[PDB]
Design a protein around this ligand. Structure first.
Ligand SMILES: Nc1ncnc2c1ncn2[C@@H]1O[C@H](CO)[C@@H](O)[C@H]1O
Ligand SMILES: Nc1ncnc2c1ncn2[C@@H]1O[C@H](CO)[C@@H](O)[C@H]1O
Lengths: 241, 241
């Protein structure tokens, strides 16, 4: 199985078993079994030395909640970097990071090795971010209970760009399958015509219309081709009239 | 255990076992064990009648990829709705949906029952979205291999708003814990002062500064209090000088 552009992802997490969600199911799972993608985990808890294996600590300045204990976390990260070798970008998932989007995903997919730091509690010591982290990334403007889901969201997204694992700046067009009529709703005839060029145009027009109606801001960031400007103008006219 | 505002989430997915990621670990896992949150899954595969339990189908109009087979998917959804009863908002996760953000999460947390439809392959028939789905939500402007992660991201986010499970429009302030000095980096003295009012102000100022430097757009959507306008002006002056 062509492993040309395989990708290696190191993960620091208090709950390594969560990653089975992507390593044991669907396309990512097959990607892993086929060695196109490799996810390796290290758990801070294994780096503790106290009897109760404490992985959290109190924050200076008081306040609700806890933080990840520095020592065990720091040791796990160092161990991960040693295993990844040179040329491994370390990422910390958090809401204060760069907001992930398609463009950001493709950039991340350029890396052959990545180490993802998943925090729990209120996060991690600001100083570790300065001394151990290369970049902070957020999957969205919302707060989660841990960095695992965000980490898995990032892995899943980049995995699609790995050759062998498997829009145009616009939203997807509507998709249809059997049956021809579903609760009175029929499949658009053009899709049944077999006319590939018309089908291409119809789908592109739908994407433009749909993007225009639901996410107009996305259109400003685009430099439309003459064909796209025409199809868009058409959809808007049909929508107005 | 006060189950006052418990929440019920129905899930339609070809990979129910993925949800263990949130039902068996951390705060969401404890929330589930304590009955504050209940996640119930239905798998389309169980609703197939052919020998090979086929859950995908070809899209009309040709094109790469497949779609979820309508019949098994439709049947699972109907079964889920019957179990949820009246007053259950059905959500389909997809990039064409409303982009999730803190505000959207709080709105979703108002619901006592939710049914999340997770697609695989290229998604689901456009017509099912019109006849079975109430709202489409996206966790971000990036494409994933399935709706499970997005579904779990949504559940995790709303779960935090359920009383008993556990920012200000601004990014979080930096957090610190032991030790006082880490690789030459010392904890900001104010945090060690014990002066709660100064600590409050210092954190608020950091959030304003941090939000201003990393995500200035987030500030335009805010109507700052006099205190916040003062602290922000201060941070910008200190940053300039
Ligand atoms: N939207 C998000 N994107 C990335 N990481 C997040 C997000 N929300 C919370 N986290 C991380 O989960 C942990 C607990 O909040 C912290 O490490 C925090 O940075
Ligand atoms: N960013 C996203 N948010 C929500 N659902 C998504 C996202 N990306 C892909 N999906 C869903 O995963 C499945 C395969 O793309 C489809 O149901 C699709 O809508």
């Amino acid at each position: 199985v062509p492993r040309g552009s395989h990708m290696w992802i190191g993960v620091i997490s208090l709950f390594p078993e969560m990653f089975k969600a992507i390593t044991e199911f669907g396309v990512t799972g097959r990607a892993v079994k086929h060695n196109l993608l490799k996810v390796e985990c290290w758990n801070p808890r294994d780096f503790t030395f106290d009897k109760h294996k404490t992985v959290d600590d109190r924050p200076y300045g008081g306040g609700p909640g806890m933080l990840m204990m520095v020592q065990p976390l720091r040791d796990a990260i160092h161990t991960a970097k040693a295993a990844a070798g040179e040329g491994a970008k370390v990422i910390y998932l958090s809401p204060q990071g760069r907001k992930l989007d398609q463009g950001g995903v493709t950039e991340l997919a350029q890396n052959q090795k990545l180490i993802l730091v998943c925090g729990r509690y209120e996060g991690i010591d600001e100083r570790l971010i300065q001394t151990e982290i290369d970049e902070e990334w957020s999957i969205g403007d919302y707060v989660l209970t841990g960095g695992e889901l965000p980490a898995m969201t990032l892995i899943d997204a980049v995995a699609r760009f790995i050759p062998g694992v498997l829009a145009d700046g616009l939203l997807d067009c509507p998709h249809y399958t059997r049956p021809e009529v579903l609760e009175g709703l029929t499949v658009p005839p053009v899709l049944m015509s077999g006319h590939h060029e018309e089908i291409r145009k119809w789908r592109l027009k739908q994407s433009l219309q749909r993007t225009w109606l639901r996410r107009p801001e996305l259109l400003e960031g685009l430099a439309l081709t003459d064909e796209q400007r025409k199809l868009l103008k058409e959809a808007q006219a049909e929508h107005n009239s």
